[PDB]
Amino acid sequence: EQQLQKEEEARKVKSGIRQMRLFSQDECAKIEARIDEVVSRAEKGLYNEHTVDRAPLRNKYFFGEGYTYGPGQERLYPPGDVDEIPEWVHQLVIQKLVEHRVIPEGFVNSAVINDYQPGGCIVSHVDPIHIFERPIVSVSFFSDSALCFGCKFQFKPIRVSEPVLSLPVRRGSVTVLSGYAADEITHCIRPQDIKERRAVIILRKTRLDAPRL
Numbered sequence: 081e082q083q084l085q086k087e088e089e090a091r092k093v094k095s096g097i098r099q100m101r102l103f104s105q106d107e108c109a110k111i112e113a114r115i116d117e118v119v120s121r122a123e124k125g126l127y128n129e130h131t132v133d134r135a136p137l138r139n140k141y142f143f144g145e146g147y148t149y150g151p152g153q154e155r156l157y158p159p160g161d162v163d164e165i166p167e168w169v170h171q172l173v174i175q176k177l178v179e180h181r182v183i184p185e186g187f188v189n190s191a192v193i194n195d196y197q198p199g200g201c202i203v204s205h206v207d208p209i210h211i212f213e214r215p216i217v218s219v220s221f222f223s224d225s226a227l228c229f230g231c232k233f234q235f236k237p238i239r240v241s242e243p244v245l246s247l248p249v250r251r252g253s254v255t256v257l258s259g260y261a262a263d264e265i266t267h268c269i270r271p272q273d274i275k276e277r278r279a280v281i282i283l284r285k286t287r288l289d290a291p292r293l
């Protein structure tokens with residue numbers, strides 16, 4: 081069988097991935113406390129309708145900009161519909177990324193927190209190309225996990241038992257997605273890779289021509 085094709089694809093995906101450990105135990109602890117605060121405030125109904133997206137395995141919290149249901153016709157909510165990026169995100173997360181030249185100042189106009197229960201997951205998807213610019217930066221928080229690329233296995237486990245690549249994502253680590261890894265392949269999380277609670281902050285810039293609702 082041609083498993084050289086799988087090695088070619090994995091190499092192409094590797095080239096769109098950069099990773100650095102940026103946040104110490106203490107820094108992570110402080111951000112985690114704030115994440116916990118977002119969850120509490122969401123339970124209290126303190127956010128706009130489109131800020132919070134509650135689902136069985138995973139909750140998402142949209143700040144700055146957000147979007148609708150996503151076959152692939154995601155739309156951007158009008159200004160004011162989602163809550164603004166909280167100051168602690170600017171101070172504790174974004175600043176540290178700018179200070180380490182991960183992304184430039186003023187790039188980030190969208191912050192999304194994904195909160196996973198054990199056994200939570202993400203189904204195969206590409207980050208909406210018509211909505212977000214690249215690179216796509218994310219920071220992992222409560223525990224360690226794995227990000228998979230080439231997620232055909234979620235649907236055809238007999239034909240292909242495995243992802244093209246699995247990327248470890250440690251607590252306090254920064255993942256940057258671009259090129260092939262962001263545009264040419266899907267990613268996902270396997271339920272089994274989420275043993276304990278895990279949250280992630282995803283920092284992006286929305287496109288200027290992003291279709292609006």
Ligand SMILES: O=C(O)CCC(=O)C(=O)O
Pocket residue numbers: 194202207218227249267268269280282
């Ligand atoms: O949970 C992660 O590390 C990736 C998040 C993700 O794929 C998304 O919400 O778009």
Ligand SMILES: [Mn+2]
Pocket residue numbers: 205206207267
């Ligand atoms: Mn994604």
